[PDB]
Amino acid sequence: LTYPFHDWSQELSPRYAQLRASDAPVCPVVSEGTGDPLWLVTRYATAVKLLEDSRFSSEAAQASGAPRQEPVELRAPGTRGDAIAMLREAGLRSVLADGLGPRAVRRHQGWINDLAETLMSELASREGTFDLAADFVEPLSSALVSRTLLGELSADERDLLAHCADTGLRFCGVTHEEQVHAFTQMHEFFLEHARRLAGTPGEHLLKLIAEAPVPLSDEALAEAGSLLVVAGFPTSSGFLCGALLTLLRHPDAVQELHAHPERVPSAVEELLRYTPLSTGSVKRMATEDLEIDGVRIKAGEVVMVSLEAVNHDPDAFEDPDVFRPGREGPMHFGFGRGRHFCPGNRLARCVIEATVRAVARRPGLRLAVAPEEISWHEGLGFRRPRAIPATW
Ligand code: HEM
Ligand SMILES: [Ca+2]
């Protein structure tokens, strides 16, 4: 099987269930983009074992010469390209926790919820239809990235970074050179502007990084900027788009949340399980000869986990393809698993929760077209509809 499976919409590729039901806990595939052989995990039980065993390394799956699912290396040529380890290396775990953890959620949750309400309120004051992607998701996720991560961006700088991230993270639809050049653009942008961005007002993470004792060079600050773009922008915008679609297709569940606001946290977790995001997989490279559920993985081979496939594994979740807030199953994989559990998870949950409450407070919000008529960006690394026509 060639990988990925080109399931660009919210419909998960049937290949995932096909490999899940097979006997093997890891199945061989071939990267469409590079022809590299890869291993693919689709079952919850195996993904836990893989992602909690640190002998399968995330860092090694990015070293020069690594087999990969992506058409290009996800870095600007000549750069280190694993900023999160570089920042942990430089001794900034405490800074990252201040900038991303519960203390940050406290600093930002107020305006995040004000903004979500304001955006939804302006849309409700309209006659007729509007576009929840352009009119709600884009301003909310852009504000999250600017105020909590990078600093104040001009609209043109937001557009450049968002576009570079989309193009850089593609599986297809652009040439390999344009993909590499997206990373180069972003890096060259942060070479010129990261230090300036770190000085703008606020308490965004890039400022905390620049203001912490280690000082961090221009190139280190620039690798921090690119990491935050690719980890925070297409993920947040993709996911908030998908979660709105999920909510608009379950008015019964929205009405329950309207009646019972205390149930919103469980709905946030179920959206993180149910709503698909990446069109590829997280990856790890065997740092030595290892065995996973009886399958030998040679040193240097790369194992992928489809989080979407795991999140829809019926061995872990009864009725996995039903949206069920309050379900009492195991932990979802929406943020991954183990040491590399998304450190953005606190701020992401904050913005997702703000979005769910803004919707639940205004029942009657609905798609203005049929789910089948929604148009999807084809070939992105993280699913995203082109527009979300909606109305009251
Ligand atoms: C402000 C927003 C976000 C920030 C700053 C952020 C940041 C990060 C960073 C730095 C990593 C790398 C951690 C590591 O390799 O040790 C990561 C991993 C991850 N992020 Fe996020 N993220 C954000 C939003 C999201 C969202 C909305 C999702 C999905 C709903 C998500 C899903 C993931 C997953 C699944 C991983 C694990 C990747 C792996 O195992 O290799 N992130 N995130
Ligand atoms: Ca090799």
Tell me the three state secondary structure of residue 367: strand
Residue 25 maps to which CATH number? 1.10.630.10
Beta partners for residue 390, in sequence order: 130, 367
3-state secondary structure 166-179: HHHCCCCCCCHHHH
- Among 282, 342, 347, 382, residue to substitute to test ligand 1 (most atoms within 8 Å of Cβ): 342
Tell me the residue length of the chain.
392
Q: Which residue is closest in CA terms to ligand 1's atom 27?
A: 236
**Ligand nearest to the backbone CA of 64:** 2
Does ligand 1 have an atom closer than 6 angstroms to the CB of 336? yes
Domain count, the chain: 1
Q: Is 103 flagged in the annotation as binding?
A: no
Q: Tell me the one-letter amino acid at 119.
A: L
Q: Is 78 flagged in the annotation as binding?
A: no
Tell me the C-alpha distance between 341 and 360, whole Å. Answer: 28
Q: Is 88 flagged in the annotation as binding?
A: yes
Q: Is 204 flagged in the annotation as binding?
A: no
Does ligand 1 have an atom closer than 6 angstroms to the CB of 226? no
- State the sign of the Cα–Cα–Cα–Cα dihedral 110, 116, 119, 124: negative
Q: Which two tokens stand for residue 189?
A: 């942008």
Give the residue among 44, 52, 50, 90 at the shortest CA–CA distance from 339.
52
Does ligand 1 have an atom closer than 6 angstroms to the CB of 335? yes
Tell me the three state secondary structure of residue 261: helix
Question: CA-based angle 315:320:323, to the nearest 5?
Answer: 155
Give the residue among 343, 381, 340 at the shortest CA–CA distance from 50.
340
Distances from the Cα of 34 to the Cαs of 5, 31, 68, 120, in angstroms?
15, 6, 7, 43
Under the phi-then-psi rule, with left for phi > 0, alpha for psi from -120 to 50, and beta for the rest, what region is 368? alpha
The CA 36 to ligand 2 mean position distance, Å, reads 10
Q: Which two tokens stand for residue 118?
A: 């304001």
Give the residue among 230, 224, 144 at the shortest CA–CA distance from 179.
230
Q: Which two tokens stand for residue 177?
A: 């050179």
Tell me the C-alpha distance between 114 and 15, whole Å. Answer: 42
**Ligand nearest to the backbone CA of 298:** 2
Q: Which residues of 261-270 are buried (b: 16+ CB within 10 A; e: fewer)?
A: eebbebbbbb
Burial zone of 178 (CB within 10 Å; 0-12 exposed, 13-18 middle, 19+ buried): middle
Q: Is 172 flagged in the annotation as binding?
A: no
Under the phi-then-psi rule, with left for phi > 0, alpha for psi from -120 to 50, and beta for the rest, what region is 67? beta
Q: Tell me the one-letter amino acid at 87.
A: L
The CA 363 to ligand 1 mean position distance, Å, reads 31
Give the single-character DSSP code of 71. S
Those residues whose C-beta lies under 8 Å from the C-beta of residue 305, and which sit 6 or more positions away, are: 40, 41, 42, 47, 50, 51, 281, 282, 283, 284, 333
Give the residue among 336, 327, 326 at the shortest CA–CA distance from 306.
336
The CA 370 to ligand 1 mean position distance, Å, reads 31
3-state secondary structure 78-141: CCCCCHHHHHHHCCCHHHHHHHHCHHHHHHHHHHHHHHHHHHHHHHHCCCCCEEHHHHHHHHHH
Q: How was this structure determined?
A: X-ray
**Ligand nearest to the backbone CA of 351:** 1
Alpha helices in 26-90 (DSSP H): 44-52, 83-89
Give the residue among 298, 335, 381 at the shortest CA–CA distance from 51.
335
Q: Tell me the one-letter amino acid at 156.
A: D
Which range marks the domain in which residue 219 is found? 2-390
Does ligand 1 have an atom closer than 6 angstroms to the CB of 282? yes
The CA 264 to ligand 2 mean position distance, Å, reads 46
- How does DSSP assign 314-345, residue by residue? TTTSSSTTS--TT---S---TT-SGGGS-TTH
Give the residue among 249, 392, 252, 276 at the shortest CA–CA distance from 334.
276
Packed helices 176-199 and 218-248: angle between N→C axes, nearest 10 degrees: 110
Ligand 1 atom, smallest distance to 51 CA: 40
Tell me the C-alpha distance between 338 and 53, whole Å. Answer: 8
Does ligand 1 have an atom closer than 6 angstroms to the CB of 146? no
Those residues whose C-beta lies under 8 Å from the C-beta of residue 62, and which sit 6 or more positions away, are: 73, 74, 75, 81, 82
Does ligand 1 have an atom closer than 6 angstroms to the CB of 379? no
Burial zone of 152 (CB within 10 Å; 0-12 exposed, 13-18 middle, 19+ buried): middle
